[PDB]
Amino acid sequence: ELAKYGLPGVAQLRSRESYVLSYDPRTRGALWVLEQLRPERLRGDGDRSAADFREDDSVHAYHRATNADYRGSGFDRGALAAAANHRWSQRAMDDTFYLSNVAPQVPHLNQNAWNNLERYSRSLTRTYQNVYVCTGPLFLPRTEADGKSYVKYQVIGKNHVAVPTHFFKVLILEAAGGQIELRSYVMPNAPVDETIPLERFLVPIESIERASGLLFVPNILAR
């Protein structure tokens, strides 16, 4: 019936203590990572980073990023579900150090503008009933001098781990009386001036949905 020998590839969801992700074996990185932030989550007893980055043995070795892929690349191991979101448990924080939760990030971005966006996201748990965060890579085309449009991204290491051109982050913010808002950001995988205000990187959710292949607003509007 064509399934006799099984199908050649299906969605790879991974549920960890601190997040759920969907994994793309072609790029060797997550398609998206989903977290729920709340205030009890952000205060410690996790907050030992005595965790090291670890390859994800639940991913077939053909399609698995390793620490050796990153070494000498010039890229940081940039965690999509952030370690500091998950001080509420050591297991929760350790799970953020799986390389399936990680993408090659320009070090300036990882340390400054993206870190600021992560801190801002946590600060909103003081305001909203619930804060959900969906984070992931983008591979965005550009028009080159021949007039044609191309996607171009570096791959690093023997395992050809894809370097995203950009990153997105979608915030779902729950306030009282059933209010639901969506705020969504894109930054380039590049040094980003840390003194640029974060709301300059707001984009409409439709542009992220079109570019990423994902759908956000139908699921949320369904409640």
Contact partner at residue 5 from a second copy, Mg ion, none, CB < 5 to 8 Å by partner kind: a second copy
Side chain identity, residue 214? L
Q: Given the rule CB under 5 A, which of 79-87, 124-132, 146-154, 181-189 is the region that contacts Mg ion?
A: 79-87
Residues near a second copy (CB under 8 A), total: 60
Both tokens of 69, joined, read 């892929």
- Contact between 92 and 82 under an 8 Å Cβ cutoff? The reply is no
Q: Which of 121, 111, 129 is nearest to 192 (CA)?
A: 111
Residue number with CB closer to a second copy (9 or 197): 9
**Which of residues 8, 147, 177, 197 is near a second copy by CB under 8 A?**
8
Contacts of 7 (CB under 8 A, 6+ apart): none
Q: Are 173 and 133 in contact (CB under 8 A)?
A: no
In the numeric block, which tokens belong to residue 12?
């790879």
CB of 78 to Mg ion, least distance (A): 6
The total of other beta-carbon atoms located within 10 Å of residue 178's CB is: 8
In the chain, the amino acid numbered 207 is S
How many whole angstroms separate alpha carbon 25 and alpha carbon 60? 9
Q: Which of 151, 175, 190, 202 binds a second copy (CB under 8 A)?
A: 151
Which residue type does 107 have? P
Contact 33, 101 (CB under 8 A): yes
Options 14, 54, 149, 185; binder of a second copy; rule CB under 8 A: 149
21 touching Mg ion, by CB under 5 A: no
Give the residue, chosen from 79, 113, 131, 171, that forms a contact with Mg ion under the rule CB under 5 A: 79
For residue 50, state whether it binds a second copy (rule: CB under 8 A): no
Enumerate residues 78-137 that contact a second copy by CB under 8 A: 132, 134
Q: Should residue 177 be labelled a site residue for a second copy when binding is judged by CB under 8 A?
A: no
Contact at 8 Å (CB) between 125 and 39? Answer: yes
CA distance 29 to 49: 22
Q: How far is the CB of 143 from Mg ion (least distance, A)?
A: 30
Question: Of residues 14, 55, 56, 63, which one binds a second copy by CB under 8 A?
Answer: 63
Contact 192, 174 (CB under 8 A): no
Site residues (vs a second copy, CB under 8 A): 2-11, 13, 15, 19-20, 22, 24-27, 31-32, 34-36, 60, 62-63, 132, 134, 139, 141, 148-156, 160, 162, 170, 172, 180, 206, 209-220, 222-223
Site residues (vs Mg ion, CB under 5 A): 79, 82-83
